[PDB]
Write a protein that binds this ligand. Structure first.
Ligand SMILES: CC(=O)N[C@H]1[C@H]([C@H](O)[C@H](O)CO)O[C@@](O[C@H]2[C@@H](O)[C@@H](CO)O[C@@H](O[C@H]3[C@H](O)[C@@H](O)[C@H](O)O[C@@H]3CO)[C@@H]2O)(C(=O)O)C[C@@H]1O
Ligand SMILES: CC(=O)N[C@H]1[C@H]([C@H](O)[C@H](O)CO)O[C@@](O[C@H]2[C@@H](O)[C@@H](CO)O[C@@H](O[C@H]3[C@H](O)[C@@H](O)[C@H](O)O[C@@H]3CO)[C@@H]2O)(C(=O)O)C[C@@H]1O
Ligand SMILES: CC(=O)N[C@H]1[C@H]([C@H](O)[C@H](O)CO)O[C@@](O[C@H]2[C@@H](O)[C@@H](CO)O[C@@H](O[C@H]3[C@H](O)[C@@H](O)[C@H](O)O[C@@H]3CO)[C@@H]2O)(C(=O)O)C[C@@H]1O
Ligand SMILES: CC(=O)N[C@H]1[C@H]([C@H](O)[C@H](O)CO)O[C@@](O[C@H]2[C@@H](O)[C@@H](CO)O[C@@H](O[C@H]3[C@H](O)[C@@H](O)[C@H](O)O[C@@H]3CO)[C@@H]2O)(C(=O)O)C[C@@H]1O
Ligand SMILES: CC(=O)N[C@H]1[C@H]([C@H](O)[C@H](O)CO)O[C@@](O[C@H]2[C@@H](O)[C@@H](CO)O[C@@H](O[C@H]3[C@H](O)[C@@H](O)[C@H](O)O[C@@H]3CO)[C@@H]2O)(C(=O)O)C[C@@H]1O
Ligand SMILES: CC(=O)N[C@H]1[C@H]([C@H](O)[C@H](O)CO)O[C@@](O[C@H]2[C@@H](O)[C@@H](CO)O[C@@H](O[C@H]3[C@H](O)[C@@H](O)[C@H](O)O[C@@H]3CO)[C@@H]2O)(C(=O)O)C[C@@H]1O
Ligand SMILES: *[C@@H]1O[C@H](CO)[C@@H](O[C@@H]2O[C@H](CO)[C@@H](O[C@@H]3O[C@H](CO)[C@@H](O)[C@H](O)[C@@H]3O)[C@H](O)[C@H]2NC(C)=O)[C@H](O)[C@H]1NC(C)=O
Ligand SMILES: *[C@@H]1O[C@H](CO)[C@@H](O[C@@H]2O[C@H](CO)[C@@H](O[C@@H]3O[C@H](CO)[C@@H](O)[C@H](O)[C@@H]3O)[C@H](O)[C@H]2NC(C)=O)[C@H](O)[C@H]1NC(C)=O
Ligand SMILES: *[C@@H]1O[C@H](CO)[C@@H](O[C@@H]2O[C@H](CO)[C@@H](O[C@@H]3O[C@H](CO)[C@@H](O)[C@H](O)[C@@H]3O)[C@H](O)[C@H]2NC(C)=O)[C@H](O)[C@H]1NC(C)=O
Ligand code: NAG
Ligand code: NAG
Ligand code: NAG
Ligand code: NAG
Ligand code: NAG
Ligand code: NAG
Ligand code: NAG
Ligand code: NAG
Ligand code: NAG
Ligand code: NAG
Ligand code: NAG
Lengths: 328, 175, 328, 175, 328, 175
């Protein structure tokens, strides 16, 4: 084939792999610090500190909680018919109208929170025989005494509180949420001054259910000049059903219905600033990027967020083992 | 790792190699040289990226959920709300911790694999003309200039062209 | 050996593996569509559309819900003393007796549902001084007015409703479930016409507990000619304990006890047809085969069923990578 | 996969082979022929079936559970019933998705393994009488009729019987 | 080079691995009994049968339940101002004072259980116009009639029970838990004998909430000579808030406050013996060692415990496959 | 397992070897002998212990939780308390069962790996002086006394010292 290769030499070929001076330690099945060429962090652990106002509809509650916004505390009149993807409730919020309590506050707040709307429709309830629009100096509307915009405090007319028995048909094709209440007087004298009968009673019902609440007379702690209280209740009336409100005293009547919807809305308690930036994941500590799979910022989240994890760092190796050649 | 090439029979990496992840260093009739192998570098990178993308595949979104912070003490129902969340967090934390552990173990074995595969591939190509010095270097037994080294690297080396020269150099000698 | 074995030929032997023209794509740790020789499906995603009546005891509720079957609405008299592994409730079920509501309907339905029996024992309650077996035209039993078969409506005798104070000892070695109730009149006039006292009261108790319910007068929506309602309550009496029913008006008395058991029974709302076939897993969409490990048919299941998963397909490779030799 | 035989040094599969999963094709004195290897085929099949049965091991049965569908709006307790189930479904869905991903990766490596093991086994048997052409074919350097090919296949090949013929053919030549 | 001189020979070197005669079967991804050289057990499946009294503070309830210890049933007077990391409740515990029921017993037991202290502070409530320290023969304190040490039964003085209206400010910097109650008389005559008014009423409130309970007259089962009952209620008063107790009859008054804390305390029902040994994990079956990662002793645990698992054995191979010389 | 050495090309283990996990057995002109290899034994042990410690890493502690046993029948809320716990137990039981299954599979492959790596290491060292008999035994083709066997074991064997003797014995013969 070829002629005399006079010289007959050799060559050396060596295979090898890179190494970096720096390197990163990662956990393994068999070791928990092994050093690799490179790794990537899978736990998002820091918020921007601000709630981005995009893409979800963030409604800042300012100094109103959602229930006060719903009831219509004077200072929350800003929120009427408002809507939201996320209502943010602030630590600073305060109530400033007639002292009330809500037996299952927690569910009423939830219920409204995820409906996502405070759209109110007024309906023509006719209360015959009682005085309407009662208010109080503890719920100042402007210079005057006032009350919650969405409720209607009835008292006697002259010398009588008749037995109210009204009805309101749900004829539309959606559910109607009604918020009503009962007034608990401080004294038996107060009970009779306002409602004549010495024992009120409110029964609100539909074809499917009924609630009867009887008031409770007695002194409570002075809150805005008052020892009395009103307790808030709610009734949902389904399409085709009918509301019947029947009372013989102490009723705080509804003025119509909030309409309920079904959506992605929820509520979040946070004092983080709202800012203009787009971010899908919201945490009460501010928005966080959902580029990583897990997060350690907060277990409370709204939107497309990483799964909360107890760990603050989890590094996924993205490179081979690092076997450098020098000394240490 | 499983194959024993990286941090195994190949004693250490080369911080000097900056143009790829695996590669060749040689010395021949024309001098000495280094060169990254881009096929095995790409193979290792593509796998690790595949692995990486699957882990970043869709955060699921959640809207209205349960309350996870409370200011008053309520008893039975609040004890359950807290327990559902805490047992959820521990289960997801376990999953994260085992997921990176498996993944990481696999990445070190996968890259160990590619190194060893490149070695095997070069072995097979050189046929009877070279011997494995056992440290990831082949002693080639025939004159191999730079274009010869290049043909081994780019996979066109014809062993026949040097088989007699090599077999003479390798065996005959004096025993 | 031989002598000059000279036949200098060679042979070639090649190793290889099969390949199929077709092949199936599967997900991997490093790739999410890699094609393999063969795979198998792990997500069961389709029902037969019929609930197989074997091996569990399926009780079709037809047009009765389980609570109406329990109370003994006339049209549900079919179900007395019946039993089940799975009571199926139909969307078409309707009530057709005296208008009632059950304060924790959800737990009473659960409670009975998993006991799995409607076996009723009648006990000799003696009501002295009142009229028994009251019924109504809204609960027609045949031509006549009637009431729930398992409850006993007491009204005044002549001009008095005495204070009832009866007792029934649990002497057997099992728990006894008692279903009782209270009647809420529409008008004060009605209250006095039936129970004389202007305010009823029912107190049912054992050594371990007590419930006192007071009625609530007022009009509700007309349901089968009536504005009144009765509300249902339940009391379990443990072995060795004693029931004491004490009332002064408006009591709907129990006629004995349902006996409770402990088993695998439950209830399911489904309009799927029952059919004769054997299947361990039931879904409200019909029975599904539990041969696969996961299912996507429905999150509601009863019996030995695959784990519900969000995914509709998950293929497990059962063969090597497919590297075809052309692809034909 | 990890070993680099399937879709690696063996360029592609044979759609033609219908009698097993791994096997031999030869070309000798009486012509050309194919034959499935049934030991490695069974080894691969048994493992994949073992894997398969463990995954179909008992559906656990559940009877009375919680309600998972509701027609009215209730608030706090119903929000928790819904949340327990949704976080249960997401955890089981994660488990299913990771389980088939690990399994699948392992099956591709396991079958790559068996191929490579058959190759190694045949290599070891042929001893000094054949050379690896580097694409999964051995060049046998001696006359090997069909019974010879069958003895390699059924594992009774005696290398000694052909060592001198092979070593002559292989080395001596002219270099 | 090296000069052999004379010998011509070969050697054989064989590599191999150990094998043990015995071996252990373990589960695998592809096989479920494969035999290995050695394995280790990961499921702890057996208790010592005794609750070690270290390192946590175990409080043995002996024959008192925690609520009786809280209320101050005579026989539980041992526990006053006691504290615990884990209160152990015994199957044998019995109550032996005035018959009471607690509406949300389950939460009151929880609430107290995790506060971890029964430290009681007595406050100077002044009840003007009523008789204090009422007791009963069903709650014998020594030779005499008595009542719960932490509650104060008020009855009329002479011929009047005035409207009590007292207040107690939370001026300290911690929450105050108040346990109060109401007495349900057996007969209307009893109601008037003790409280004059024919209908009592208790309203307890703070700025944040209110409860009004009205008693319920009627006979219950004879329990320690009595058909009457008292029901227990609780009110937490936060720093800066104020308690107002207002009643007109049937009030069982508080004598001060339990102080609440936040810690790792809980309660456990167990009849296991307490013993002197140190063990972090407690199970109602006795303490178990947390050296293994999973346990099968009991799903109820307190302390650093292994995760409960359904499996009773899970062996982790710690050695190679066992391929012995002869057999196994 | 994946490499096919243990319960593969090495037909079985040696119950006789009690001083380590992997090792050597030899037959030369001075005698026969056995000796454990302590480097591969330590490598296998260290990995299995690493694996083992990670699994015994901190039991998390839990104090006040939910009730998990009930004596009366309550309905809705108690049905949820029971369901949260039962779906928690099934999820943790699944995790335990998959965890030992993965771990175990890996341990059998990891030890198969170390065996095969020791084999490869010895192969590389012996160079042209020995041939693999295919059952994990090398036929060494030159006089190898006990110090020679010891140098292979402790890794100082100089192949050059015997290359001509070996190549003569191995090839030349009569073909
Ligand atoms: C519809 C209506 O009646 N509006 C009244 C209210 C209601 O009568 C009252 O909210 C019922 O709970 O009362 C208004 O006057 C009250 C106000 O001056 C407060 C301030 O303290 O005092 C109430 O009387 C107290 C009295 O001040 C106390 O010292 C005493 O111990 O008890 C009394 C209890 O009645 C006044 O009624 C109001 O503004 O709230 C006037 C409204 O028009
Ligand atoms: C994390 C947390 O703070 N959880 C609390 C919540 C939140 O404060 C609330 O959801 C914010 O919207 O409050 C819970 O308690 C409420 C409950 O006691 C009700 C009455 O039953 O009152 C609420 O405060 C009222 C107050 O009674 C009114 O007089 C006032 O007009 O408005 C206040 C609210 O702004 C309590 O906050 C709750 O049940 O939601 C307890 C949680 O721990
Ligand atoms: C045991 C018993 O009393 N059975 C009666 C019942 C009960 O009196 C009644 O259910 C108490 O709620 O009444 C029955 O007659 C009622 C029936 O005719 C309905 C049909 O509408 O009307 C009731 O009187 C109504 C009246 O029709 C209305 O227009 C009015 O506005 O109010 C009245 C309220 O009492 C009848 O009482 C019955 O069949 O249900 C006769 C039973 O024997
Ligand atoms: C998936 C779903 O539909 N969940 C509903 C259930 C089911 O309808 C029910 O479990 C079927 O058995 O109903 C829930 O609401 C019930 C509740 O409002 C009670 C009263 O508190 O009434 C039930 O309807 C009664 C009606 O009041 C009676 O007059 C009539 O005689 O019978 C009806 C039932 O057939 C409501 O269904 C529930 O709590 O279980 C609400 C769930 O969302
Ligand atoms: C503060 C106070 O009043 N202490 C009384 C109590 C209370 O009057 C009583 O707990 C209110 O519920 O009563 C004490 O005497 C009762 C005791 O002798 C029991 C034993 O059975 O009987 C009660 O009278 C019963 C009578 O025995 C029954 O046969 C009858 O059917 O009903 C009567 C209902 O009042 C005694 O009142 C007591 O020790 O509990 C005396 C305390 O000083
Ligand atoms: C596992 C278990 O037994 N769970 C029970 C619990 C436990 O018995 C209790 O937590 C032990 O502390 O009891 C539950 O029922 C209680 C409830 O019925 C209340 C009243 O609503 O009474 C308790 O019994 C009282 C009895 O009423 C008093 O007269 C007596 O003085 O003390 C008894 C307690 O020692 C019931 O136990 C509970 O709700 O916690 C039901 C659980 O299923
Ligand atoms: C029942 O008892 C309560 C508690 O003792 C009484 O409440 C107290 O009533 C007085 C007089 O109304 C309140 O006085 C007010 O004090 C504020 C300053 O804090 C002052 O600005 C007002 O002008 C007024 O003077 C006092 O605050 C209030 N305290 C509490 C804790 O509520 C109640 O009046 C008693 N009721 C009856 C009918 O006896
Ligand atoms: C209190 O107010 C309610 C609501 O206004 C009154 O209810 C209504 O009462 C009337 C007379 O009983 C019911 O009329 C009957 O209805 C049926 C079906 O339409 C029809 O066949 C009869 O001929 C008659 O019209 C009406 O349905 C009922 N409506 C509702 C919503 O319940 C109630 O009567 C009032 N009660 C008192 C004491 O004032
Ligand atoms: C209302 O009905 C209940 C049940 O019938 C009556 O309860 C029973 O009352 C008697 C007389 O007080 C109790 O008797 C006492 O029993 C003890 C224990 O044996 C004994 O030492 C006394 O000498 C006496 O016999 C009986 O135990 C009790 N039974 C139950 C189940 O509670 C109640 O008295 C009736 N009340 C009225 C006002 O009619
Ligand atoms: C480390 O890995 C991540 C993910 O693969 C990649 O973005 C990054 O650039 C890598 N670092 C280097 C120096 O390649
Ligand atoms: C709220 O929206 C309803 C529905 O369009 C409207 O009729 C009503 O007047 C609105 N009220 C306010 C204050 O915006
Ligand atoms: C997020 O907020 C919580 C509560 O506000 C706080 O405890 C936590 O440490 C914060 N973490 C980060 C990363 O901001
Ligand atoms: C390989 O290298 C030789 C020498 O540089 C060259 O002639 C040949 O074309 C190269 N082939 C490829 C595919 O690069
Ligand atoms: C594909 O795999 C499944 C499970 O191993 C098996 O039943 C089926 O027959 C396989 N398909 C073929 C063509 O072998
Ligand atoms: C099963 O039924 C549910 C509700 O009835 C329905 O939404 C779902 O799509 C059905 N799925 C199948 C596979 O039938
Ligand atoms: C192997 O093949 C040869 C030739 O067919 C035959 O003589 C021998 O017996 C075979 N051995 C086995 C075990 O099949
Ligand atoms: C079996 O493995 C465990 C954990 O590694 C170890 O403690 C034990 O000593 C081993 N058994 C033997 C005989 O080595
Ligand atoms: C309980 O502790 C308080 C606070 O130091 C103390 O004043 C009170 O007297 C104690 N009572 C008893 C019975 O120990
Ligand atoms: C632990 O206790 C429970 C209930 O007391 C019992 O059923 C269980 O079998 C016991 N297990 C062990 C290991 O003691
Ligand atoms: C290896 O073995 C030979 C013969 O025993 C000895 O001379 C040499 O020093 C040994 N080297 C080591 C590192 O043990």
């Amino acid at each position: 084939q070829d002629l005399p290769g006079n010289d007959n030499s050799t060559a050396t070929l060596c295979l090898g792999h890179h190494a970096v001076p720096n390197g990163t330690l990662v956990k393994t099945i068999t070791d928990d610090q092994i050093e690799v060429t490179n790794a990537t962090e899978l736990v998002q652990s820091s918020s921007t500190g601000k709630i981005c106002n995009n893409p979800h509809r963030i409604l800042d509650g300012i100094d109103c909680t959602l229930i006060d916004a719903l009831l219509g505390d004077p200072h929350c009149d800003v929120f009427q018919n408002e809507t939201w993807d996320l209502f943010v409730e602030r630590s600073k919020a305060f109530s400033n109208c007639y002292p009330y309590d809500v037996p299952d506050y927690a569910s009423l707040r939830s219920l409204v929170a995820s409906s996502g709307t405070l759209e109110f429709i007024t309906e023509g309830f006719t209360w015959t025989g009682v005085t309407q629009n009662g208010g109080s100096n503890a719920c100042k509307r402007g210079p005057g005494s006032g009350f919650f915009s969405r409720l209607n405090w009835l008292t006697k007319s002259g010398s009588t509180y008749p037995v109210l028995n009204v009805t309101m048909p749900n004829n539309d094709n959606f559910d109607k949420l009604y918020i009503w209440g009962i007034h608990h007087p401080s004294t038996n004298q107060e009970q009779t001054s306002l409602y004549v009968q010495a024992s009120g009673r409110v029964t609100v019902s539909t074809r499917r259910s009924q609630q009867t609440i009887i008031p409770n007379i007695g002194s409570r702690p002075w809150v805005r000049g008052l020892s009395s209280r009103i307790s808030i209740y709610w009734t949902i009336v389904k399409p085709g059903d009918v509301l019947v409100i029947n009372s013989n005293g102490n009723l705080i009547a509804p003025r119509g219905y909030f309409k309920m919807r079904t959506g992605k809305s929820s509520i979040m308690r946070s004092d983080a600033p709202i800012d203009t930036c787009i971010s899908e994941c919201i945490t009460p500590n501010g928005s966080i990027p959902n580029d990583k799979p897990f997060q350690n910022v907060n277990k409370i989240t709204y939107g497309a967020c990483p799964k909360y994890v107890k760990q603050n760092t989890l590094k996924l190796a993205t490179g081979m083992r690092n076997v450098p050649e020098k000394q240490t | 790792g499983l194959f024993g090439a990286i941090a195994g029979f190949i004693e250490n990496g080369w911080e000097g190699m900056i143009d790829g992840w695996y590669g060749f260093r040689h010395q021949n009739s024309e001098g000495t040289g280094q060169a990254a192998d881009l096929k095995s570098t790409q193979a290792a990178i593509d796998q690790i990226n595949g692995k990486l993308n699957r882990v970043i595949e869709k955060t699921n979104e959640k809207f209205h959920q349960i309350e996870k912070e409370f200011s008053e003490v309520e008893g039975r129902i609040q004890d359950l709300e807290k327990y559902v969340e805490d047992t959820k967090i521990d289960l997801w934390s376990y999953n994260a911790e085992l997921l990176v552990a498996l993944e990481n173990q696999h990445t070190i074995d996968l890259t160990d694999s590619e190194m060893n595969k490149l070695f095997e591939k070069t072995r097979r190509q050189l046929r009877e003309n070279a011997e494995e010095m056992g440290n990831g270097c082949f002693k080639i037994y025939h004159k191999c200039d730079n274009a010869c080294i290049e043909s081994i690297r780019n996979g066109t080396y014809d062993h026949d062209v040097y088989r007699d020269e090599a077999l003479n150099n390798r065996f005959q000698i004096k025993g």
